[PDB]
Amino acid sequence: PIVQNLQGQMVHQAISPRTLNAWVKVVEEKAFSPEVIPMFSALSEGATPQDLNTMLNTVGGHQAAMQMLKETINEEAAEWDRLHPVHAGPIEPGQMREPRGSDIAGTTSTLQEQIGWMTHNPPIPVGEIYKRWIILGLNKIVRMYSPTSILDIRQGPKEPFRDYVDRFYKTLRAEQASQEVKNWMTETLLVQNANPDCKTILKALGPAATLEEMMTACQGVGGPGHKARVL
Amino acid sequence: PIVQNLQGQMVHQAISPRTLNAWVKVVEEKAFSPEVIPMFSALSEGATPQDLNTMLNTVGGHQAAMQMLKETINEEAAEWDRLHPVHAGPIEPGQMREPRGSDIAGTTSTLQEQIGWMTHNPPIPVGEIYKRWIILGLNKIVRMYSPTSILDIRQGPKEPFRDYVDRFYKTLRAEQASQEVKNWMTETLLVQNANPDCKTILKALGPAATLEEMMTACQGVGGPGHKARVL
Amino acid sequence: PIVQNLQGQMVHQAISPRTLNAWVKVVEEKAFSPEVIPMFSALSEGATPQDLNTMLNTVGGHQAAMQMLKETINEEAAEWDRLHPVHAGPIEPGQMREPRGSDIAGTTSTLQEQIGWMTHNPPIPVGEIYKRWIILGLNKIVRMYSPTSILDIRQGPKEPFRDYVDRFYKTLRAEQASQEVKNWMTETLLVQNANPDCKTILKALGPAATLEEMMTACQGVGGPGHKARVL
Amino acid sequence: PIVQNLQGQMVHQAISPRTLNAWVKVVEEKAFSPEVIPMFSALSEGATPQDLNTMLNTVGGHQAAMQMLKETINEEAAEWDRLHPVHAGPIEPGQMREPRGSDIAGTTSTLQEQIGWMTHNPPIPVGEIYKRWIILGLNKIVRMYSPTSILDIRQGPKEPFRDYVDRFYKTLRAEQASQEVKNWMTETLLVQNANPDCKTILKALGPAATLEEMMTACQGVGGPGHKARVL
Amino acid sequence: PIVQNLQGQMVHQAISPRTLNAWVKVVEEKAFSPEVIPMFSALSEGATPQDLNTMLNTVGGHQAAMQMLKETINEEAAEWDRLHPVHAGPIEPGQMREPRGSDIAGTTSTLQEQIGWMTHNPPIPVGEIYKRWIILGLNKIVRMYSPTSILDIRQGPKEPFRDYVDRFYKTLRAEQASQEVKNWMTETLLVQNANPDCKTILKALGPAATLEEMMTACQGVGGPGHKARVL
């Protein structure tokens, strides 16, 4: 990553063993569940196209999964070539060159280059583009390896509403459909798959109540000396 | 916060990717428990609101917990707006503008405004202030996500009293109990549901013991049984 | 390891105690698996040769594997010196001195001289060259301690297609077979050892299908409809 | 109701007793059916607010559903006057008087003014509006008493594509969603385990695969035969 | 639809629901059988887009056929915009404007425009245009489900020829196969699957001949004649 957003000295240093450890844990012990997606981004803060290449190849030994990320990113870079014909003219005073596709994926661009653009003012956002190309790759990984579906997130009979809501919301966040398709699942699916008493409370306040208000009312019914309704 | 570099001139910098890594080891270990808010107190030391929003943004797995925290800010932010009269931008030429709720929360404010507000006369500690909004949001997520009720914590025959006291004080912590409620619970409920080994000594102590005195009576070092809990 | 400056040249710092701890846990957990390579590559971004020697020194386990790797390394160093490999940067440096094989590996070169070569313009990239020579041995230990197995692979009777796709990738990676062969085995053996009712799909897929197009049409095994297992 | 006559001019006729029986027959004897609306539309052609009120109040069966319809048109009539204050600002001779929503629902307007709007040129859609508000009632009454469920319909590994479209679009006559949700539904959601033959067939068709072909796809030896049933 | 009652005719009426119920009977008895297509043209003489939408919406189920029909209509509407570039913003009541594809489909057009294009000088054929695209719809339905096996057909032991060739014909018309194939089937399969004495006398005629000649030649026993009404 880059390790200084102002300072020139020691601008960038190679990846942490905790970043690798915890990367390897999500793709193995959480086994490509949808919570991978937002977690990837929290890892990638200030990551260079090379750091990103390191993250692409460090997905827990899963070689076939490397191929589905890899072919994706490359198609996206080949697309960047279709959208951007090459300027060779005078570069303006203080300005850098504009990246190519093979530059975005770090094949043609120096690591000084990658640092340069990432600390430029206004930024040339190469790592923030490549990581969204990688999440698109990553999204394919989650569909083949984990059978998780927002359709089939179901609240258990003695199950806490907080554990069922955590599953629905992490599964929701990794959908790539629009914000209207998203806002519909929290109105429809979430109320519809809660237990009888919690479903009754969710519709009673209606889904226009805040999540904490929903949450506190749903723990309140499912808390001490509970009734598991038969189904 | 302020650098750790022990050559020359101290200079103010953001939160570091090593610290970001540390927060990720904290989250994916303690996650939502009472045990989060003190680690947070540590790692957010000399943070600006921009760091605080980086601390929020670099969370991965638990997107409900984050929707409740993002939510809890808006309501305290709005409160702040309702508490103070603020006109938009400078009220006078060449003097600083007054903070709004959304400025405390980093959204509507630049980082260059942010270190301005802090170097005002008197100081406006916009981070420190903001950390309180965050911690109420944390306390809300933790109370709901925490799993033991305070009204059903009982000590078995082979359970160490240290382990049961940490679970009781951590259950009284999850539920955000007043000191008046903690002093009454301490006195009452605790003594009762200790095992008869601790309990008959706890009962031999006279009116209004300190928790030190409850431990000195009970302890009773080592055991119960073979190879006691250190968690 | 070498850390980057925003303008100007790379600077050498001492290795992290965790990087060391991480690598040991790597050679305990993954030695006989093709997971040794991406982790080793991950823990040797911006490494010098003394970084690469420190990682090799750190191991106190798996001594017969290190020995095979060491005799292997000397084979491409002796080759270096005799049959003059192609490389980027100076083949006859004027103002500094020819890298030998031993020097690339760092048994006869001081750390200054290695920095000397990597800080050069054009550089002589001694670190990356060495890491290829360790990765040759990493393949060798993976081949010797996990032998031929690509022909014996079958998709299980109850096994989803992607779980056995995921194994075929691991197997074929472990296999070390020629790239004309890798490309045939992905074209026809991947279909050959598959489920029979999934192979009917795979025939309509053809040879030039992506993994994602194949993992989308064919999923789990699936089973008799309208039945229940025997009692 | 109003009859159209030459030059597109409008001429008035009293409500037939046969139209009213016709409407009691569609309400009671095509009860709750989506088909209820288009028949309705064919009964309400040139209807004044008065003819609609007679239509609605003529009916004596199904009074839980006429109640939600009376609540829905009241709400819509009071909504209307927020959005448009009648006769705002400067008053202009030459106008029939503007309809408030209480005139639209026929509550503060007389026959003379009801004829006023519809013999105007261009015709003021007073009765047309009320019908579109009543169809909102009827579509809601349809949703309320339909039996199909959106959490039952999905394509499993034995189901034809047709067989699932028929049921799913049978759902959505009753159950309302956006097209972005319907498109996401057919892309991925309700199709997670969908028929292996259909996948085989869908690939075998190429990049010239049509919806008509995809419906014709998939047959076996259960259910109806292949022999024709239409004289 | 638009009556031809009255001097200088251009007068719209509602469709009678009896007419709607006679259409419920055609589809009850004949489904989508090929002679539903010109009946549907006959039902929709002088009809509007709103009438048509009414006649479509009153159909009993078939929701996969309804979709396939609906997307078929949406592509003819879409190319219709490509074949006639027409534009509009907000629609003005009373104003003669050029119809777009959406206005020809009843989707965007109020009924006064629809009648208004129909009764312009020249009449602009908006009812025709869409009725033609619904007939292409039905014609698509007929392609998919009307064919059944003609190779079933063999003349019964006591069967006269005028029952067996009509039955040949009824199944031949059922199949959607191109004409020159059908001509082939006439000169071969009608003769080859015929009884011994028949096929013989059909080989004496030569099957090249007119159907009057085949009826005269292959003559069988008289009586009432089976009218073909057992299915």
JSON list of N, CA and C in Angstrom, two decimals, chain D residues 4-34:
[
{"chain": "D", "resi": 4, "resn": "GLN", "atom": "N", "xyz": [-70.86, 9.19, -26.72]},
{"chain": "D", "resi": 4, "resn": "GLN", "atom": "CA", "xyz": [-70.24, 10.01, -27.75]},
{"chain": "D", "resi": 4, "resn": "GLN", "atom": "C", "xyz": [-71.12, 10.09, -29.05]},
{"chain": "D", "resi": 5, "resn": "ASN", "atom": "N", "xyz": [-71.18, 11.22, -29.64]},
{"chain": "D", "resi": 5, "resn": "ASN", "atom": "CA", "xyz": [-71.90, 11.42, -30.87]},
{"chain": "D", "resi": 5, "resn": "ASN", "atom": "C", "xyz": [-71.05, 12.25, -31.78]},
{"chain": "D", "resi": 6, "resn": "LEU", "atom": "N", "xyz": [-71.45, 12.35, -33.10]},
{"chain": "D", "resi": 6, "resn": "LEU", "atom": "CA", "xyz": [-70.69, 12.96, -34.19]},
{"chain": "D", "resi": 6, "resn": "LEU", "atom": "C", "xyz": [-69.94, 14.22, -33.82]},
{"chain": "D", "resi": 7, "resn": "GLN", "atom": "N", "xyz": [-68.80, 14.39, -34.52]},
{"chain": "D", "resi": 7, "resn": "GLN", "atom": "CA", "xyz": [-67.76, 15.44, -34.33]},
{"chain": "D", "resi": 7, "resn": "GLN", "atom": "C", "xyz": [-66.98, 15.21, -33.04]},
{"chain": "D", "resi": 8, "resn": "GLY", "atom": "N", "xyz": [-67.06, 13.98, -32.43]},
{"chain": "D", "resi": 8, "resn": "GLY", "atom": "CA", "xyz": [-66.63, 13.68, -31.05]},
{"chain": "D", "resi": 8, "resn": "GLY", "atom": "C", "xyz": [-67.38, 14.50, -29.95]},
{"chain": "D", "resi": 9, "resn": "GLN", "atom": "N", "xyz": [-68.76, 14.81, -30.09]},
{"chain": "D", "resi": 9, "resn": "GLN", "atom": "CA", "xyz": [-69.46, 15.58, -29.06]},
{"chain": "D", "resi": 9, "resn": "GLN", "atom": "C", "xyz": [-70.27, 14.61, -28.11]},
{"chain": "D", "resi": 10, "resn": "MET", "atom": "N", "xyz": [-70.42, 15.12, -26.88]},
{"chain": "D", "resi": 10, "resn": "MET", "atom": "CA", "xyz": [-70.89, 14.19, -25.91]},
{"chain": "D", "resi": 10, "resn": "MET", "atom": "C", "xyz": [-72.35, 14.40, -25.48]},
{"chain": "D", "resi": 11, "resn": "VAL", "atom": "N", "xyz": [-73.14, 13.34, -25.46]},
{"chain": "D", "resi": 11, "resn": "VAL", "atom": "CA", "xyz": [-74.51, 13.33, -25.22]},
{"chain": "D", "resi": 11, "resn": "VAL", "atom": "C", "xyz": [-74.97, 12.34, -24.07]},
{"chain": "D", "resi": 12, "resn": "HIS", "atom": "N", "xyz": [-75.91, 12.81, -23.19]},
{"chain": "D", "resi": 12, "resn": "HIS", "atom": "CA", "xyz": [-76.20, 12.19, -21.95]},
{"chain": "D", "resi": 12, "resn": "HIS", "atom": "C", "xyz": [-77.39, 11.14, -21.98]},
{"chain": "D", "resi": 13, "resn": "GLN", "atom": "N", "xyz": [-77.29, 9.99, -21.25]},
{"chain": "D", "resi": 13, "resn": "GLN", "atom": "CA", "xyz": [-78.25, 8.92, -21.12]},
{"chain": "D", "resi": 13, "resn": "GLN", "atom": "C", "xyz": [-78.25, 8.37, -19.72]},
{"chain": "D", "resi": 14, "resn": "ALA", "atom": "N", "xyz": [-79.40, 8.08, -19.08]},
{"chain": "D", "resi": 14, "resn": "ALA", "atom": "CA", "xyz": [-79.52, 7.49, -17.82]},
{"chain": "D", "resi": 14, "resn": "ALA", "atom": "C", "xyz": [-79.06, 6.12, -17.72]},
{"chain": "D", "resi": 15, "resn": "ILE", "atom": "N", "xyz": [-78.50, 5.73, -16.58]},
{"chain": "D", "resi": 15, "resn": "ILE", "atom": "CA", "xyz": [-78.00, 4.42, -16.28]},
{"chain": "D", "resi": 15, "resn": "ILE", "atom": "C", "xyz": [-79.00, 3.30, -16.50]},
{"chain": "D", "resi": 16, "resn": "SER", "atom": "N", "xyz": [-78.53, 2.33, -17.33]},
{"chain": "D", "resi": 16, "resn": "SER", "atom": "CA", "xyz": [-79.35, 1.14, -17.71]},
{"chain": "D", "resi": 16, "resn": "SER", "atom": "C", "xyz": [-79.51, 0.15, -16.49]},
{"chain": "D", "resi": 17, "resn": "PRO", "atom": "N", "xyz": [-80.63, -0.65, -16.31]},
{"chain": "D", "resi": 17, "resn": "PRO", "atom": "CA", "xyz": [-80.65, -1.56, -15.17]},
{"chain": "D", "resi": 17, "resn": "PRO", "atom": "C", "xyz": [-79.75, -2.82, -15.51]},
{"chain": "D", "resi": 18, "resn": "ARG", "atom": "N", "xyz": [-79.76, -3.19, -16.80]},
{"chain": "D", "resi": 18, "resn": "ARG", "atom": "CA", "xyz": [-78.88, -4.20, -17.33]},
{"chain": "D", "resi": 18, "resn": "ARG", "atom": "C", "xyz": [-77.39, -3.90, -17.08]},
{"chain": "D", "resi": 19, "resn": "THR", "atom": "N", "xyz": [-76.89, -2.63, -17.20]},
{"chain": "D", "resi": 19, "resn": "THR", "atom": "CA", "xyz": [-75.43, -2.35, -16.82]},
{"chain": "D", "resi": 19, "resn": "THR", "atom": "C", "xyz": [-75.12, -2.69, -15.41]},
{"chain": "D", "resi": 20, "resn": "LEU", "atom": "N", "xyz": [-76.00, -2.37, -14.49]},
{"chain": "D", "resi": 20, "resn": "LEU", "atom": "CA", "xyz": [-75.94, -2.60, -13.02]},
{"chain": "D", "resi": 20, "resn": "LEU", "atom": "C", "xyz": [-76.02, -4.10, -12.66]},
{"chain": "D", "resi": 21, "resn": "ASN", "atom": "N", "xyz": [-76.95, -4.87, -13.33]},
{"chain": "D", "resi": 21, "resn": "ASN", "atom": "CA", "xyz": [-76.89, -6.31, -13.17]},
{"chain": "D", "resi": 21, "resn": "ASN", "atom": "C", "xyz": [-75.59, -6.90, -13.67]},
{"chain": "D", "resi": 22, "resn": "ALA", "atom": "N", "xyz": [-75.09, -6.45, -14.86]},
{"chain": "D", "resi": 22, "resn": "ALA", "atom": "CA", "xyz": [-73.87, -6.86, -15.51]},
{"chain": "D", "resi": 22, "resn": "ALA", "atom": "C", "xyz": [-72.65, -6.77, -14.56]},
{"chain": "D", "resi": 23, "resn": "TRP", "atom": "N", "xyz": [-72.48, -5.64, -13.85]},
{"chain": "D", "resi": 23, "resn": "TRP", "atom": "CA", "xyz": [-71.57, -5.29, -12.80]},
{"chain": "D", "resi": 23, "resn": "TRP", "atom": "C", "xyz": [-71.71, -6.05, -11.52]},
{"chain": "D", "resi": 24, "resn": "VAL", "atom": "N", "xyz": [-72.99, -6.27, -10.98]},
{"chain": "D", "resi": 24, "resn": "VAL", "atom": "CA", "xyz": [-73.20, -7.24, -9.89]},
{"chain": "D", "resi": 24, "resn": "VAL", "atom": "C", "xyz": [-72.77, -8.66, -10.24]},
{"chain": "D", "resi": 25, "resn": "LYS", "atom": "N", "xyz": [-73.10, -9.14, -11.50]},
{"chain": "D", "resi": 25, "resn": "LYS", "atom": "CA", "xyz": [-72.53, -10.39, -12.03]},
{"chain": "D", "resi": 25, "resn": "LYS", "atom": "C", "xyz": [-71.03, -10.48, -12.18]},
{"chain": "D", "resi": 26, "resn": "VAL", "atom": "N", "xyz": [-70.34, -9.40, -12.64]},
{"chain": "D", "resi": 26, "resn": "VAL", "atom": "CA", "xyz": [-68.85, -9.52, -12.68]},
{"chain": "D", "resi": 26, "resn": "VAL", "atom": "C", "xyz": [-68.25, -9.51, -11.29]},
{"chain": "D", "resi": 27, "resn": "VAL", "atom": "N", "xyz": [-68.78, -8.54, -10.43]},
{"chain": "D", "resi": 27, "resn": "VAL", "atom": "CA", "xyz": [-68.26, -8.61, -9.01]},
{"chain": "D", "resi": 27, "resn": "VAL", "atom": "C", "xyz": [-68.49, -9.91, -8.27]},
{"chain": "D", "resi": 28, "resn": "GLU", "atom": "N", "xyz": [-69.77, -10.39, -8.23]},
{"chain": "D", "resi": 28, "resn": "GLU", "atom": "CA", "xyz": [-69.98, -11.58, -7.50]},
{"chain": "D", "resi": 28, "resn": "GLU", "atom": "C", "xyz": [-69.52, -12.86, -8.19]},
{"chain": "D", "resi": 29, "resn": "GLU", "atom": "N", "xyz": [-69.42, -12.94, -9.57]},
{"chain": "D", "resi": 29, "resn": "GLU", "atom": "CA", "xyz": [-69.37, -14.15, -10.23]},
{"chain": "D", "resi": 29, "resn": "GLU", "atom": "C", "xyz": [-68.13, -14.21, -11.09]},
{"chain": "D", "resi": 30, "resn": "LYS", "atom": "N", "xyz": [-67.24, -13.22, -11.01]},
{"chain": "D", "resi": 30, "resn": "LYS", "atom": "CA", "xyz": [-65.82, -13.38, -11.43]},
{"chain": "D", "resi": 30, "resn": "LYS", "atom": "C", "xyz": [-64.97, -12.85, -10.29]},
{"chain": "D", "resi": 31, "resn": "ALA", "atom": "N", "xyz": [-65.41, -13.12, -9.03]},
{"chain": "D", "resi": 31, "resn": "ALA", "atom": "CA", "xyz": [-64.92, -12.55, -7.86]},
{"chain": "D", "resi": 31, "resn": "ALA", "atom": "C", "xyz": [-63.34, -12.51, -7.63]},
{"chain": "D", "resi": 32, "resn": "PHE", "atom": "N", "xyz": [-62.78, -11.31, -7.42]},
{"chain": "D", "resi": 32, "resn": "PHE", "atom": "CA", "xyz": [-61.41, -11.15, -6.94]},
{"chain": "D", "resi": 32, "resn": "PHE", "atom": "C", "xyz": [-60.37, -11.43, -8.06]},
{"chain": "D", "resi": 33, "resn": "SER", "atom": "N", "xyz": [-60.86, -11.63, -9.27]},
{"chain": "D", "resi": 33, "resn": "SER", "atom": "CA", "xyz": [-60.09, -12.11, -10.37]},
{"chain": "D", "resi": 33, "resn": "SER", "atom": "C", "xyz": [-59.45, -10.88, -11.01]},
{"chain": "D", "resi": 34, "resn": "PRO", "atom": "N", "xyz": [-58.23, -10.88, -11.54]},
{"chain": "D", "resi": 34, "resn": "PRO", "atom": "CA", "xyz": [-57.61, -9.81, -12.33]},
{"chain": "D", "resi": 34, "resn": "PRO", "atom": "C", "xyz": [-58.46, -9.38, -13.50]}
]
